[PDB]
Design a protein around this ligand. Structure first.
Ligand code: CL
Ligand code: CL
Lengths: 348, 452
């Protein structure tokens, strides 16, 4: 292209040793490490470039999501396994006695919609300092930018489905209880203190200030698989089992600005590239990730520009399923995908 | 139908003073004929030397007037022909089998840096043509001293016994007596190495150096002025003393607080965070020992004065840099930068435009090393499971993406295994080029030896 560039093109690295599909991938806040939750029930931490596995732990029965505490002050990893949330401190070169102590004092500070307890004996020996139990199995986990608040979504959870957790008081609460249907997943706003909750039909947006609805947006899909919010906050992107991907401009309208079908199979994951670059990718049940370039001029008066830059293949479709997750490197334009191969793959 | 020709050369010890003058038969004339002409008693009086030829920066693989025919160039005009010593192909010879991934490889030889350092002033032994050693660092957490014949003389101490507490990312020979390594334990360890009459050695750690918070991914040494510098994932470059004699006291908040025996724990005599992203490479300047070059993922190569903490220059490239190496070539060097973008950028730190780009690697270039003989040449090694040999005298104008470009002269594959997608199983972590030559360790758990 003329200038679009970077974009991921080829797969430079493969992460192996997960038996069974890899459910999730999360890149370190400082971008030197990769986290992968397994269907084997193991959380693994890897050196990003080499593909070396520097750490693993068996929580146990599958790990659905892994997310880092989005602060470089900590190095704290969060996992969702069955009904428990595990806050842990991976053994890493990046973890010194100082940083270890710091994160330990972040987790230990603050010593039932959720039940906070020490996982006990063997688990705390391996660096897992916390377990939070809710009453229905947890699909999604999201962090707030400052890293004190984190939300967990449990689709079958009836109305305790969307839960917001404060790490300070060890406080689980279930606000704005009130929805139109089953909650798939949730997200915090990048700038303002807002909150997004995606159901199967629609994506509702609440203000944590007044604890009530601000704006409801309709993607126009039969079932929402997932979504993600732009760093600017003014735009987001939705994706579905309807094979279609929808760009939503929240300034211009509450129904999608653009619709794209690049896939013959369901889209299981969608992620913007946080931290400055006009890249976003979506993952499909065919082994392909589709990489788009898109740009918000953040002075408004003009519409965002969307073009697909790539289709990344090489994930093997294994037992009916394709790529289950994506995550972006913080600075560099590298992405990492979690497929049903039992592998994670690095793309540059 | 004859054609006149003029030889030119960058080779230091081979030149025809007036005799650049010749008229030649261009009939079935190729590399061969011309090479046997240069070797003739009338010209270089070498007589055995394989040569290759570059017209305007391009190898001649074809017949000379088929060359001037294709380009449409007239018959009678003269073709100025650069001639270079043709690289003797480094085919496969030996393999040293490890238990885990090989992170680092270095060679102790008479012409190797540590050999030249140990030869002078002694306090060490100048290595004999018989006795060469090959150091290998592994993700085991184990250093290994190897025979030239490929046997293990000695292995570094275990675990609790004072060895590394994690994987070893990098290692080098500072002298035949002393060697240095670094790893995921954030420590830089300095080792004393002695060898028995019968062949078994001992590696006793002399020094544990804690300056870093992060993995130490790169290590470079100077055996003369007894100094180490390290590139770490914290975005910092450490500068260290390998002697217990002069070392600063460690921070003590970086210390572990196993414990079989105690070796002196010391800090860096300098540490500098000059990088936004993890620092991938740190090297001494080939000539001035007080100047260093840093490479990082922040796209920067930084010229760094070791005297002060100062950074005297900064050079920004288009992609994150995973490796760096200096070639002599002029009292300042020419840097080579291995990239995440699969290229190798040739960079002049002197007072930014790139001289040329080395293209054709399929993955991240994690290691580099200059040729021991003709130094317009260099070897690279990369996560695609290959080591590629380049000649900088070979150059072509860029096409779709810009300048000037050099394609590889030779390609060294992994004999352990089509070439597997990405780096699967084959990744090359480290390459060193000696006159024993081209030792390459990596993910396939072996050190491969290639020479002619
Ligand atoms: Cl495969
Ligand atoms: Cl190739």
């Amino acid at each position: 292209p003329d200038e679009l560039k970077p974009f991921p093109t080829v797969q430079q690295t493969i992460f192996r040793g997960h038996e069974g599909r890899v459910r999730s991938v999360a890149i370190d806040p400082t971008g030197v490490a990769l986290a992968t939750g397994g269907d084997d029930g193991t959380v693994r931490v890897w050196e990003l470039l080499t593909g070396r596995q520097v750490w693993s732990v068996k929580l146990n029965e599958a790990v659905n999501t892994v997310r880092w505490r989005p602060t470089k002050d900590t190095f704290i990893l969060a996992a969702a396994a069955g009904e428990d949330i595990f806050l842990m401190i991976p053994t890493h070169p990046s973890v010194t006695p100082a940083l270890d102590q710091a994160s330990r004092d972040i987790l230990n500070a603050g010593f039932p919609p959720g039940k906070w307890a020490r996982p006990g004996t063997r688990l705390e020996d391996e660096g897992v300092l916390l377990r939070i139990t809710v009453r229905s199995t947890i699909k999604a986990i999201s962090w707030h930018r400052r890293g004190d608040h984190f939300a967990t979504v449990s689709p079958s959870g009836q109305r305790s489905s969307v839960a917001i957790h404060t790490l300070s008081k060890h406080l689980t609460q279930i606000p704005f209880r009130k929805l139109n249907g089953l909650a798939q997943t949730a997200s915090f706003h990048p700038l303002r203190p807002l909150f997004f909750v995606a159901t199967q039909r629609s994506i509702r947006c609440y203000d944590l200030q007044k604890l009530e609805l601000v704006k409801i947006v309709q993607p126009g899909a039969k079932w929402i698989s997932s979504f993600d919010v732009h760093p600017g906050g003014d735009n987001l992107v939705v994706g579905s089992y309807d094979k279609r991907l929808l760009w939503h401009d929240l300034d211009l309208s509450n129904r999608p600005y653009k619709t794209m079908r690049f896939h013959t199979e369901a889209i299981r994951a969608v992620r913007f590239h946080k931290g400055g670059l006009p890249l976003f990718a979506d993952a499909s049940d065919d082994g392909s990730l589709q990489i788009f370039h898109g740009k918000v001029p953040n002075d408004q008066l003009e519409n965002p520009t969307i073009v697909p830059v790539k289709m990344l293949k090489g994930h093997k479709v294994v037992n009916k399923l394709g790529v289950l997750d994506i995550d972006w490197h913080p600075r560099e334009p590298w992405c990492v995908s979690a497929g049903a191969d039992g592998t994670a793959r690095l793309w540059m | 139908a004859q054609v006149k020709v003029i030889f030119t050369t960058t080779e230091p010890d081979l030149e025809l003073p007036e005799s650049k003058r010749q008229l030649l038969v261009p009939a079935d004339i190729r590399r061969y004929g011309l090479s046997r002409i240069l070797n003739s008693e009338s010209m270089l009086d070498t007589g055995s030397i394989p040569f290759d030829f570059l017209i305007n920066g391009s190898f001649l693989r074809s017949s000379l007037e088929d060359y001037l025919t294709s380009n449409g160039l007239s018959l009678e005009t003269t073709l100025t022909l650069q001639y270079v010593r043709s690289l003797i192909p480094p085919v496969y010879e030996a393999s040293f089998e490890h238990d885990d991934w090989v992170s680092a490889v270095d060679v102790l030889s008479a012409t190797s840096p540590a050999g030249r350092w140990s030869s002078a002033a002694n306090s060490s032994a100048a290595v004999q043509p018989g006795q060469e050693r090959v150091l290998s660092a592994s993700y085991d957490g184990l250093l290994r001293i190897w025979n030239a014949s490929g046997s293990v003389i000695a292995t570094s101490p275990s675990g609790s016994h004072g060895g590394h507490t994690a994987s070893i990312k990098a290692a080098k020979f500072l002298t035949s007596d002393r060697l240095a390594s670094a790893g995921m334990d954030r420590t830089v360890r300095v080792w004393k190495y002695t060898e028995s009459d019968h062949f078994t050695g001992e590696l006793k750690p002399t020094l544990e150096l804690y300056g870093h918070t992060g993995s130490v991914d790169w290590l470079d040494v100077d055996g003369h002025s007894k100094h180490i510098l390290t590139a770490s994932a914290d975005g910092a470059i450490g500068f260290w003393s390998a002697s217990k004699a002069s070392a600063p006291e460690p921070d003590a908040s970086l210390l572990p607080g196993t414990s079989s025996v105690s070796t002196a724990q010391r800090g860096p005599l300098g540490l500098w965070s000059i990088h936004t992203a993890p620092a991938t490479a740190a090297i001494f300047d080939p000539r001035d020992r007080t100047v260093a070059y840093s490479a990082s993922q922040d796209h920067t190569v930084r010229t760094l004065d070791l005297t002060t903490g100062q950074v005297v220059s900064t050079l920004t490239l288009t992609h994150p840099l995973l490796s760096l190496s200096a070639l002599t070539r002029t009292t300042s060097p020419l840097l080579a930068a291995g990239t995440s973008a699969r290229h190798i950028t040739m960079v002049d730190p002197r007072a930014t435009t790139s001289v040329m780009t080395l293209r054709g690697h399929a993955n991240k270039v994690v290691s580099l090393s200059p040729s021991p003989e003709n130094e317009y040449s260099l070897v690279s090694g990369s996560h695609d499971g290959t080591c590629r040999v380049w000649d900088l005298r070979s150059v072509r104008p860029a096409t779709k993406e810009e300048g000037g470009v050099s394609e590889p002269v030779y390609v060294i594959e992994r004999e352990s295994w089509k070439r597997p997608v990405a780096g699967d199983g084959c990744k090359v972590f480290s390459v060193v080029w000696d006159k024993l030559g081209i030792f390459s360790g990596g993910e396939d758990k072996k050190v491969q030896v290639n020479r002619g």
